[PDB]
Amino acid sequence: KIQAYFNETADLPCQFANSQNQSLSELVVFWQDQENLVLNEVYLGKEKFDSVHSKYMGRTSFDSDSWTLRLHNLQIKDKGLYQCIIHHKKPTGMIRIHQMNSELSV
Amino acid sequence: KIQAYFNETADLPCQFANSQNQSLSELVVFWQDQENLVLNEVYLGKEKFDSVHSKYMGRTSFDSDSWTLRLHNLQIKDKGLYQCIIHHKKPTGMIRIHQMNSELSV
Amino acid sequence: KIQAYFNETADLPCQFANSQNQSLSELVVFWQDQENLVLNEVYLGKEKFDSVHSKYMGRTSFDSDSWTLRLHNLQIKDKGLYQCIIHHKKPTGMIRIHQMNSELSV
Amino acid sequence: KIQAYFNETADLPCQFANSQNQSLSELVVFWQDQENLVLNEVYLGKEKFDSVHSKYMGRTSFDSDSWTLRLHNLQIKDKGLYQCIIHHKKPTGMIRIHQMNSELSV
Amino acid sequence: KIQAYFNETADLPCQFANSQNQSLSELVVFWQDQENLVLNEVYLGKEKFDSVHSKYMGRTSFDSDSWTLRLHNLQIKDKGLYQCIIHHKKPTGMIRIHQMNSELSV
Amino acid sequence: KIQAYFNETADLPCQFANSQNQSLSELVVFWQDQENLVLNEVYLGKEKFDSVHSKYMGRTSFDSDSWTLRLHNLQIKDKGLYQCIIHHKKPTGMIRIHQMNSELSV
Amino acid sequence: YKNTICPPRQDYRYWYFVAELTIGVNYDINSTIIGECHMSESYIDRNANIVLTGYGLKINMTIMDTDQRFVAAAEGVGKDNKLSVLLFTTQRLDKVHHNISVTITCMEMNCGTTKYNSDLPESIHKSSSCDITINGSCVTCVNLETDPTKINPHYLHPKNKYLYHNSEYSMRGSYGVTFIDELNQCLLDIKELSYDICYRE
Amino acid sequence: YKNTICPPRQDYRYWYFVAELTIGVNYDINSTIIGECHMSESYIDRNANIVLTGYGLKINMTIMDTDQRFVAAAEGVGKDNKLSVLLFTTQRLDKVHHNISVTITCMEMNCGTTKYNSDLPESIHKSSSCDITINGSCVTCVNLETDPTKINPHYLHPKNKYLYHNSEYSMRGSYGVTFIDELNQCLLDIKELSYDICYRE
Amino acid sequence: YKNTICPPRQDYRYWYFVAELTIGVNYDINSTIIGECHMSESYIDRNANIVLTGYGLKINMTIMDTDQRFVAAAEGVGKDNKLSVLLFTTQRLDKVHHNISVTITCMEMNCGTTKYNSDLPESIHKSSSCDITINGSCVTCVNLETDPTKINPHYLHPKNKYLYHNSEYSMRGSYGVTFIDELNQCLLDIKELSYDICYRE
Amino acid sequence: YKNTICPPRQDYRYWYFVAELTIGVNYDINSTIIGECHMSESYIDRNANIVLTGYGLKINMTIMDTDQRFVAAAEGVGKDNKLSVLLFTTQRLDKVHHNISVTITCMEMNCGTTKYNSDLPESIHKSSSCDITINGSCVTCVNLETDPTKINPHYLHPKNKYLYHNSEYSMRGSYGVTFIDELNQCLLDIKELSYDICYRE
Amino acid sequence: YKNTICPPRQDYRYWYFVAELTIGVNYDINSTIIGECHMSESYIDRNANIVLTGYGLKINMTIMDTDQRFVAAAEGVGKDNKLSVLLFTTQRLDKVHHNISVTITCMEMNCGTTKYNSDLPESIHKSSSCDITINGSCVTCVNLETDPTKINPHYLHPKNKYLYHNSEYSMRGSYGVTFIDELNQCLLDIKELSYDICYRE
Amino acid sequence: YKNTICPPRQDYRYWYFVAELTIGVNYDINSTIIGECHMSESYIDRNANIVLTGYGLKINMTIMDTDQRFVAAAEGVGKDNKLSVLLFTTQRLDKVHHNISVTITCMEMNCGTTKYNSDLPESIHKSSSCDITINGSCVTCVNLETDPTKINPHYLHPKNKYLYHNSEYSMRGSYGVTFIDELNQCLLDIKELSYDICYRE
């Protein structure tokens, strides 16, 4: 697993290899907690905030070039493991293609 | 049904058509009440009084020409329907050939 | 049945017709009460007293010519019917050939 | 559904298209309430009042040209939906051919 | 059965006929009580005292010529019947050949 | 069984005949108590002390030439029978080849 | 369109009281036995037939030219060795009198060959006839009231079934025969009477 | 018209007391056993036949030229090793005496070949005869009262059945044989007696 | 890809309320009998068929050109001899009105040949038709509401099953016929009503 | 006339105490087991035969030239591994001594071929003989008292059956064999003894 | 020497938690029914196969090139119409990822032909694939976790059996597909969940 | 005369404690299950054979050139996954050591081909040998004590049977094999142990 450091800024990377070399334009990219509350939601390149829980509301930023979510304002409570899930949205059906679990200790 | 009038003399007719045109010499001719007590009994032309109930004992007369029983001394109690039964006595077995039900209101 | 008269002497006859015309020398001839107590017992012409009840002990006499038991000293008690039984003693087996029931009123 | 206006006069139309183009002379035309009490009854062109409930007794008028029942003297109670039923009376059997449900708010 | 006399000396004989005419050298000869306690025991001509009950211990004598056990010092208690048992000892198996029951009243 | 003498030094021999004439270099040679606590353990010629119980810890010596365990400092408690077990260690599986039970009374 | 008979079934519930058969016997029957009567029905060529085995009697009664089939029967024993039989068909689809044939044959006690055979005329309206024949000397009296206007009050109907009976005097029929020198007396006492529904059909 | 026999059935209810068979035996029977007696009936060519297996005895009794068939039997054990058999047919349709044949064969204890064979004459009116034959030495006495005027008071009839017996002395019959040197004594004590109805038929 | 029917099974749990059949009869049915109704289903060549035997009636109703099969039925008896039938299929995969054929044939009481045969037009939207035919004179009224928007409150569904019904007025259908000179009155009282689920299928 | 055997039957009630077989064994039998013994009877060509399976032993005992057949047996276990067998036939029709053959074969524990075979002479009156043969080394002692004058007091007879035994010393028979160097001791303790009636026949 | 599969047996007790199949449906399943699920196992040519009939679904899942056979399954119904299936094989004899094929075919409610067919890639380590095909439109979501590291706490194991599960993250596998425009949500609530062990095998 | 084997029977009561087989396994068996063990016996050509199915193991043990046949077995589970088997034959008719062959094949958990095959020498007196072969990797230890002088105190014998065991050290035999790098430890804890008698034979 991958961990992050103390109370400045946490970096959670998906580390998607992208072996099929497909673009981010058709890719559902999102993060979630060990208690399964959504952190961010990238639907087709636009961040969606409707499913984001109020605890992480307006706290997370996303970097598309490094495929990394930056969590700001670390607390004592958020020591759980965070997993990022990458679906590939297809009109016939949305298929999960990648998932990874990282840790976070502050 | 056939009814009769007030407290003078009641006439109950059998109204046997006698289509076989047989004589009264071999014919069991008798009358009875709604509670089934025998009024008269003509066995072979001779009146038999052994089965006559004590309530109608020596009160009824019989007319062979009109085939009619005359009940005398009408009471308040005897308002029931009276039925006359005509059997044809045969040595092999006695067969009922006619029955009729008349009424009586006084 | 056959009855007898008052308190002098009762005569109970067997009235055996003896159609086979056999002699009394081989014939078991005896009498008994309604309560089945033996009165007399003629085995082969000799009276046997061992099975005679004590009530009729030494009270009955027997006449072979008329085949009749004479009961003496009539009492009030002995008003029952008396039956006489005649067996034909054969060495293969003793066969009852005649029985008769008489009455006795005193 | 079709509704009507306030406390002056309600108009409930059947709106029968009459695609078979048959006359009103053989047609059972009637109206009823949500609690299923008969308002009017046109049997063969003559209004029948025997099945009309006492609540609508002598209150409803009928127009054959517009096929419309006019309900007068609107109350607070009669806010329910009213349905009109058109049977086609045939001697072999009476067949319902049309029904419609209208509303009424006052 | 065979009995014996009063309080001097009892003689219990086996009365073995010895029809096979075999000698006493191979013969188990012994006596016992109604309660089945051993009196004497002659195994191959030598008296054995190990199975002799203490009540008859040193009280019985044996005579080989007459085949008779002499019981001395008669008591009131020993009025039971005494039986003598003669086995024929064979190395394959010991076979009882004779038994007899005598009585004893004193 | 084989016993030993009083409170000086006990000698427990295995008395392995060694009919296969194999060397001690591949042989698991050990001793144990009636309550099955290990006394010594010779694995491939080197004594192993990890499974030796603390009661016999540093108390037993071993002689390879006579194949005999010398138990020093005899107590009152160690009067039980001692058994020596000789396994033949093979890489496919360790096979017990000899066992013997000796006694010890002090 | 014509009104026809209903198809057969195992358990019929709509019963019509068709007949009151009232055989008197000269041998002792003391009481109504539960599960004694056994009936067999048939409907062949517009003729209804019921055969009743019970209380020492077998009753073979057939009705000619009917749209009815016998579906039920209840037998009961009155005082003075009288046997009352209540018979039930499906429904009355015609208002005409039907010809009746009864065979009363004696199973136990007094048994024999054809003691009696006659055609009993219908007492009221004289439209029909009852061909009766009695096989044995065990019968004192026979009374048969076809389509009676009154049920016996001592007969209790089953709860799951429905009972209909005649209400018109014009449909009534009376047939009667006595072999004992006593006028009438075929009628039941109706004082202490109990009925049992017969087993089959 | 002729009065005939009734047809056979599984369970007969109108019984007529025809005979009182009173075999005495010399072996010990101590009490009446429930469910011990087994009877088999036959009615072939106007001859009634009953075979009774029980209490160490088999009784094959046939009556010639009768309109009766054996329908029931009750066996009971009295004191002094006496065996009383009560027999019941359908009904008495003739007032004539019938010839009787009894075969008493011994099943257990004293068994053998034909110990006895004779024709016992009827004691009263001398009209009939009883061909008796005894297969074994187990019989001391035989008493047979055909159509008795009195039932044993110790015999209880079943509630659902009906019992009739003779009332005339002219129809009584007595047959008896003794093989032991004691006059009579075939009769039961009738002090402590119990009867069992036999199993089959 | 096309949405098709589900395969048959012994016990179906997802029921769709398809029809409310409301036969009135002129013979007496007093109450709802538990275990009375018996239904038989068939789905052959896109035609659903249910045959209902019960309360003196047999109902052979088939629906043409459907992707539904009849899986359940509940029959109940209201006051004034009214018979309400609730019918349930699998699921509604089409929003088109289907043609209906009902055969109401009378098993008991008034029985006969084809009393009635007609095509009842659909009352609302006039898209379909009901070929009704009535075999017997035992029917006063027929009411059939295809895809009703309301269940009867007196019908209790089983706990392990699931019920769905129509919610749109555009899918409702009404067919009705009366043979008695009374307007409507086919409707149930809905005061004291009890339903029984039919036995088979 | 000749006195013969009785015919076979399923359940015999008149038993005659014929023999007391008293096998001692050297293996441990601790108590009498209910339902352990199984007997099989045969009577072929005037030879009675009983085969007893139980308590580790099979006993095939036949009696030659007899009018008796074995009908019952009761086995019991005494102290010191002694096995007492009580045997019962029908009846004693002859007062002559019969020749006896016993085969004692060992089912479990010590099993083998013919360990012993001899003719044991009858101890009292020397009229008969017992051909004994023992198949196995499991037998210490054999005692057989043919027609004993005394029953064991520990044997309880069934209530429905009857028991007879010999009363004359002239009909007694004793056969005995020991294979252990101890005089007699074949006899039971008769202190705490219980008998079980064997299962079949 | 090679480590092979174990032979088949009727009742297996050593279970290995292989998979967590989490079908979401769009029709109403309200609760877990005892005795609802029925499973059929097969192991032919190194391919394990389990067919699960229950809750309106049939699941035909086969694993290719394995030394495991499906021995158990437990189905449970969560909130929002989610169906969790727990699957158990014998033992894990290889540490390699296996290719998976799931056929989810809809038995009732929404039924049809092949709505979906795809190869779902394994989410973590991308070594295997899941050939999924869905026969019907009754499936909202599919989640399959092959060799999970955690059992559901709401699943109670039988007392006589033994349970083993994966403990390494490297052996975990995740396959998922959604057909409804909602991210994830295939997961169970795990608040009020009950599991039933399927019937056969 | 020669001392031979006893004939076979369904239920043997004289048992001889022949062997103490003490397989240790590496998979979890937690307790002794009532009715788990199933044994099959054979005695063909002077070779005794017992096959034991239970606790995930099948044990095929045969003894060559014996006059004994396996009649009973009791299996029990000790701590640390140890399986103790107690075996019982008829009787010891020879005082010679017999050659032993054990096949321990693994039914569940770790299954495979022939992991082990060797001839274990007898530890004391070295007269015999044990051809052991182990089909699977599920066995840690095997201990076999042939004719032990002591029964396990935790084994309760049935009340109706009798138990005998060896009392001489010269008839003792020890065979042992370990596959785990721990001296001995095959022995049971004998602290909390329960035995179950196997089902068949």
Numbering used by the authors:
A (entry chain H), B (entry chain L), C (entry chain K), D (entry chain G), E (entry chain J), F (entry chain I): 27 to 132
G (entry chain F), H (entry chain E), I (entry chain A), J (entry chain D), K (entry chain B), L (entry chain C): 20 to 220
Relevant lines from the article:
Here we reveal that MPXV M2, co-existing as a hexamer and a heptamer, recognizes human B7.1 and B7.2 (hB7.1/2) with high avidities. The binding of oligomeric MPXV M2 interrupts the interactions of hB7.1/2 with CD28 and CTLA4 and subverts T cell activation mediated by B7.1/2 costimulatory signals. Cryo-EM structures of M2 in complex with hB7.1/2 show that M2 binds to the shallow concave face of hB7.1/2 and displays sterically competition with CD28 and CTLA4 for the binding to hB7.1/2.
We finally determined three complex structures, M2-hB7.1 hexamer, M2-hB7.2 hexamer, and M2-hB7.2 heptamer, at an overall resolution of 3.04, 2.7, and 3.12 Å, respectively. Structural analysis reveals that M2 interacts with hB7.1 and hB7.2 similarly. The interfaces of the two complex structures have very similar atomic contacts and bury a total accessible surface area of 1760 and 1617 Å2, respectively. M2 binds to hB7.1/2 side-by-side via β-strand complementation mediated by the C-terminal half of the M2 β11 and the N-terminal part of the hB7.1/2 G strand. The long C-terminal loop of M2 sits on top of the shallow concave surface, formed by the natural twist of strands G, F, C, and C’ of hB7.1/2. Extensive residues from the C-terminal loop, β8-β9 loop, and β10-β11 loop, and to a lesser extent, the β8, β9, β10, and β11 strands form a network of both van der Waals and hydrogen bonding interactions with residues from strands G, F, C, and C’ of hB7.1/2. For hB7.2, CTLA4 makes 14 contacts with hB7.2 and M2 makes 15 contacts with hB7.2, with 8 of these being shared residues. Surprisingly, the binding ability and half-life of M2 with hB7.1/2 significantly increased in this setting, leading to a KD of 0.15 nM and t1/2 of 397 min for hB7.1-M2 complex and a KD of 0.05 nM and t1/2 of 1180 min for hB7.2-M2 complex, respectively.
